[PDB]
């Protein structure tokens, strides 16, 4: 009856542990709901990912959003090479609504180390945009090749400057100094494509893979033409974690010989469950 209910709490604690292990996280992240509210961006790529809802073991990362470290924006990511696998990289910025129709000039500059000539900056995108009152807009800037150079050589990234201004030079900032602005900060959207046997006589480390050969000729199952034998193996909860198929050529006893692929016939790896 309800013996399972007691065990149910410990199954949930086990899944928690397994989730952290599949992620690659030593501890559960400590983030307040308030801080989540501040950092979660209210932008198209996140509304796309959220709106959908409403190495065998490890998790595979498809997309990474990096917020600014800590001042116009610096991005720090320990993201591990993968220029080659970095499929796309976009800087997302939100331009706040304006009061009157105004044309807004945006320039986004990569910093480089100051020299005599070409002091301070390089240039990534410059925009001229016409805004009407009441609505702000999100802009997505391709920075794939830029971001790759940063990963290839850290210390070549000093961050970026973003300027936004009207025809006369007055500033109208993209940087929001208030509690009421939530999810409105800039962010970087990067898409990437990341990817115990024993002897028959061995006294095991409990869970282990043990050899087992199935000989159809031995059972007088002569209808199977090929394989005559195969290595199935077994585990000694200690259970198979990974299996492979075999192909079989056999008589079905209906005047037909069939050649077929039989899934999950061979145990390749076992693990504890």
């Amino acid at each position: 009856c309800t013996w399972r209910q007691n065990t149910k709490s410990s199954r949930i604690e086990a899944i928690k542990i397994q989730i952290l292990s599949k992620l690659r996280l030593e501890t559960a992240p400590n983030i307040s709901k308030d801080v989540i509210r501040q950092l979660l961006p209210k932008a198209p790529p996140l509304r796309e990912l959220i709106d959908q809802y409403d190495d065998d073991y490890h998790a595979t990362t498809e997309t990474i959003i990096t917020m600014p470290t800590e001042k116009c924006c610096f991005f720090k990511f320990s993201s591990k090479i993968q220029y080659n696998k970095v499929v796309k990289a976009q800087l997302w910025i939100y331009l706040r609504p304006v009061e009157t129709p105004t044309t807004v000039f945006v320039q986004i500059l990569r910093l480089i180390k100051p020299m005599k000539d070409g002091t301070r900056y390089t240039g990534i995108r410059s925009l001229k945009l016409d805004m009407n009152p009441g609505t702000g807009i999100w802009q997505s800037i391709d920075v794939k090749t830029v971001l790759q150079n940063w990963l290839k050589q850290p210390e070549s990234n000093l961050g970026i400057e973003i300027k936004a201004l009207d025809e006369n030079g007055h500033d109208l900032a993209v940087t929001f100094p208030g509690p009421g602005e939530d999810g409105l900060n800039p962010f970087l959207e990067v898409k990437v494509t990341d990817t115990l046997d024993c002897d028959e006589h061995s006294t095991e480390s409990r869970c282990c893979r043990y050899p087992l050969t199935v000989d159809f000729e031995a059972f007088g199952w002569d209808w199977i033409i090929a394989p005559k034998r195969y290595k199935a193996n077994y585990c000694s909860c200690c259970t198979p974690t990974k299996m492979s198929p075999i192909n079989m050529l056999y008589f079905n006893g209906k005047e037909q010989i069939i050649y077929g692929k039989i899934p999950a016939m061979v145990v390749d790896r076992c693990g504890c469950s």
Epitope: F105, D142, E167, N168
Partner: antibody, heavy 125, light 108 residues
């Protein structure tokens, strides 16, 4: 939002001419300004650009030394002074304004979305 | 100079591509802008910073930049598109440079 050009004509080789381009509808001193021309049935050729206040001027090698660009931000007007005119200078001359304001870096790198109606100058004996 | 094929054509609804080859001093380091010019009117800017459209310009006009080359591609080809099309960029020797122009014919 408009650029209204003036002052072309026919002129003898080695002699001189001055074009005008008057702007309205935007803050004239917030933009770099250019002159571009086109010979009868040929392509566009950029001739010069000038900075917002007049302190930098760059010229195509073909007019370097003979043409001079300038501006009077108080009369909202762009000028080009042409000397030592040759027959290959004959063309329609267009004035154009930078798409971006001079408060951004490299504003003149990015292109020109404004453009006057054009002025014909013909260089012939 | 930047190099553009002298000519191009399409049928109404077809997708044409105008090409621009240049040098590392210009296109390779610097933003490309594209112009349309109808017979006896001034140029009109279609594209800037490689792939951005100014106000009033349909997204059937798109453009890109790889290395030392750029492309202007007109999807959904209307017959108003019959015109000359020019690329341009700033060269590091301090001068703006146009390409030679591409006549686009809209077989009508």
């Amino acid at each position: 939002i408009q650029l209204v050009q003036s002052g072309g004509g026919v002129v003898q080789p080695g002699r001189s001419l001055r074009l005008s381009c008057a702007a309205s509808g935007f803050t004239f001193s917030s933009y770099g300004m250019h002159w571009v021309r086109q010979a009868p049935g040929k392509g566009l050729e950029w001739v010069a650009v000038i900075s917002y206040d007049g302190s930098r001027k760059y010229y195509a090698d073909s007019v370097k030394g003979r043409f001079t660009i300038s501006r009077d931000n108080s009369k909202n007007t762009l000028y080009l002074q042409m000397n030592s005119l040759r027959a290959e200078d004959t063309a329609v001359y267009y004035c154009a304004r930078d798409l971006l304001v001079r408060f951004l870096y490299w504003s003149h790198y990015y292109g020109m979305d404004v453009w006057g109606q054009g002025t014909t100058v013909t260089v012939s004996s | 100079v930047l190099t553009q094929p002298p000519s191009a054509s399409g049928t109404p609804g077809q997708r044409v591509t105008i090409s621009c080859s240049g040098s590392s001093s210009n296109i390779g380091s610097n933003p490309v802008h594209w112009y349309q010019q109808l017979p006896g009117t001034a140029p009109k800017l279609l594209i800037y910073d490689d792939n951005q459209r100014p106000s009033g310009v349909p997204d059937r006009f798109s453009g890109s930049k790889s290395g030392t080359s750029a492309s202007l591609v007109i999807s959904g080809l209307q017959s108003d598109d019959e015109a000359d099309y020019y690329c341009a960029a700033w060269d590091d020797s301090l001068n703006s440079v146009f390409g030679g122009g591409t006549k686009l014919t809209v077989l009508g």
